[PDB]
Design a protein around this ligand. Structure first.
Ligand SMILES: NC(=O)c1ccc[n+]([C@@H]2O[C@H](COP(=O)([O-])OP(=O)(O)OC[C@H]3O[C@@H](n4cnc5c(N)ncnc54)[C@H](OP(=O)(O)O)[C@@H]3O)[C@@H](O)[C@H]2O)c1
Ligand SMILES: O=C(O)COc1cc(Cl)ccc1C(=O)NCc1cccc([N+](=O)[O-])c1
Length: 315
C-alpha cells in the first residue's frame, strides 16, 4: 500500500522526495522528473533555500495536467529562528508563497531548538555557539495549531524530537491537535527502535530522513561510515537484483515508516521509486537492524548546550 493514514484522516504517501542540498539550479528538474515517475510526496524546508524552485516544478506539472493538487502531499518545516509565536504564521506563509500553494499537507517544527530571531539561520556568538531564543516547545506548538485552524496547513507535526519532547506536547493541557508525524533520522546505522516504538504506540507516524546516509552532507569526514558503500548491504542488494539504495529505501517501508530519499539525478530519482516490486526477507530485515551503531548524520555540536537539544536523551 502506497499511503499511510494520519490522525487527521488524510493519507500520506510512504515514499517521498527529499530536497535538502538540491541546488536551485537543478531541483526544478528533479521535482518534474519525480512527479513524472510517480512521486506524490515532496519534503521541503525554508532553510533548504530552494522552495521557490520546487514551487515552479509543481506548478508546471499542474499546468501540464500531469497531476492534481489533491494528489500531491507537500511537506515543509518551520525553521529554528521563527519559533516565537508572533513569527510562525509569517514563516508558514513565506513557504506557501515560495511554493506557490495555498496549503501544505503537513507542516513540521524542524528542530525543537529555537534560535535567536534575525536573518541568519544559524546565529552564532563571537565564540561559535548558536544563540538560542527565549522560546519553548509548547508555545511554539500552540502557534502551529493556529495554522491548522486557519486552513493554511492540513496537519502539523514535529521533527528531531526525543520521546520526552513528544510527551510534553501530548501532555499539554488544552492540546488542540496531536502531532501527526515525527520526522527523524533513520537508517541501518541509526535504527531508532525505542523512538519508533514510542511514536507508533502513540499513533504518531514516523518519517525516516537521510535513509541513504546523506553522503552529501556538508560536514562529512572521510573516515565516517558509509551506508551506500557497505559491502554487507551491497550483498543483500545483489541477492535481490536491486541496488543498495533500493534496499535502503525498502527497509524503512517494511517498518511501517515513511521514507524520503533525496536525489537531483533523474536516473536515480526513477531508480529510487522502483521499490514496490520486491520484499526484504525476515533475515534481511533483522540483519539490517543489527548494523545499528547509534551513528548520526544530523547532530550539531554547537547546539549541545541548548536547553532543548534533543540527543542527550537515550531516545
Ligand atoms: N527534518 C530534518 O531535520 C531533516 C534532516 C536531514 C534530511 N531531511 C530530509 O531527508 C531527505 C533525505 O536525506 P538527505 O538529503 O540527508 O540524504 P539521503 O537521501 O540519505 O542521501 C542523499 C544523497 O544520496 C545520493 N543518492 C540518491 N539516490 C542514490 C542512488 N540511488 N544511488 C546512489 N546515490 C544516491 C544523492 O545524490 P544526488 O542527489 O547527487 O543524485 C545525495 O548525495 C533530505 O533531502 C530532507 O528532505 C530532513
Ligand atoms: O536540518 C536539516 O533538515 C538538514 O540539516 C541542515 C540543513 C541546512 Cl540547509 C543547514 C543546516 C543543517 C544542519 O546543520 N542541521 C542539523 C541541526 C540543525 C539544528 C539543530 C540541530 N541540533 O542538533 O540541535 C541540528
Amino acid at each position: 500500500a502506497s499511503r499511510i493514514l494520519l490522525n487527521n484522516g488524510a493519507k500520506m504517501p510512504i515514499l517521498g522526495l527529499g530536497t535538502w542540498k538540491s541546488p536551485p539550479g537543478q531541483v526544478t528538474e528533479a521535482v518534474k522528473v519525480a512527479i513524472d515517475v510517480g512521486y506524490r510526496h515532496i519534503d521541503c524546508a525554508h532553510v533548504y533555500q530552494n522552495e521557490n524552485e520546487v514551487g515552479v516544478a509543481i506548478q508546471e506539472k499542474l499546468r501540464e495536467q500531469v497531476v492534481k493538487r489533491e494528489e500531491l502531499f507537500i511537506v515543509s518545516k518551520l525553521w529554528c529562528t521563527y519559533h516565537e509565536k508572533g513569527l510562525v504564521k509569517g514563516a508558514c506563509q513565506k513557504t506557501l508563497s515560495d511554493l506557490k500553494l495555498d496549503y501544505l499537507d503537513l507542516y513540521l517544527i524542524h528542530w525543537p531548538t529555537g534560535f535567536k530571531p534575525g536573518k541568519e539561520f544559524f546565529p552564532l556568538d563571537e565564540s561559535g555557539n548558536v544563540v538560542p531564543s527565549d522560546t519553548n516547545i509548547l508555545d511554539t506548538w500552540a502557534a502551529m495549531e493556529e495554522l491548522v485552524d486557519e486552513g493554511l496547513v492540513k496537519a502539523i507535526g514535529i521533527s528531531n524530537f526525543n520521546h520526552l519532547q513528544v510527551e510534553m506536547i501530548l501532555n499539554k493541557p488544552g492540546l488542540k491537535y496531536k502531532p501527526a508525524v515525527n520526522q527523524i533520522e533513520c537508517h541501518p546505522y541509526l535504527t531508532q527502535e525505542k523512538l519508533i516504538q514510542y511514536c507508533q504506540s502513540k499513533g504518531i507516524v514516523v518519517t525516516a530522513y537521510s535513509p541513504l546516509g546523506s553522503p552529501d552532507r556538508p560536514w562529512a569526514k572521510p573516515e565516517d561510515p558509509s551506508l551506500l558503500e557497505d559491502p554487507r548491504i551491497k550483498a543483500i542488494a545483489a541477492k535481490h537484483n536491486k541496488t543498495t539504495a533500493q534496499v535502503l529505501i525498502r527497509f524503512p517501508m517494511q517498518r511501517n515508516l515513511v521514507v524520503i530519499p533525496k536525489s537531483v539525478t533523474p536516473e536515480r530519482i526513477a531508480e529510487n521509486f522502483k521499490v514496490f516490486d520486491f520484499e526484504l526477507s525476515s533475515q534481511d530485515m533483522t540483519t539490517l537492524l543489527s548494523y545499528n551503531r547509534n551513528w548520526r548524520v544530523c547532530a550539531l555540536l554547537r547546539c549541545t548546550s541548548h536547553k532543548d537539544y534533543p540527543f542527550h536523551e537515550e531516545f
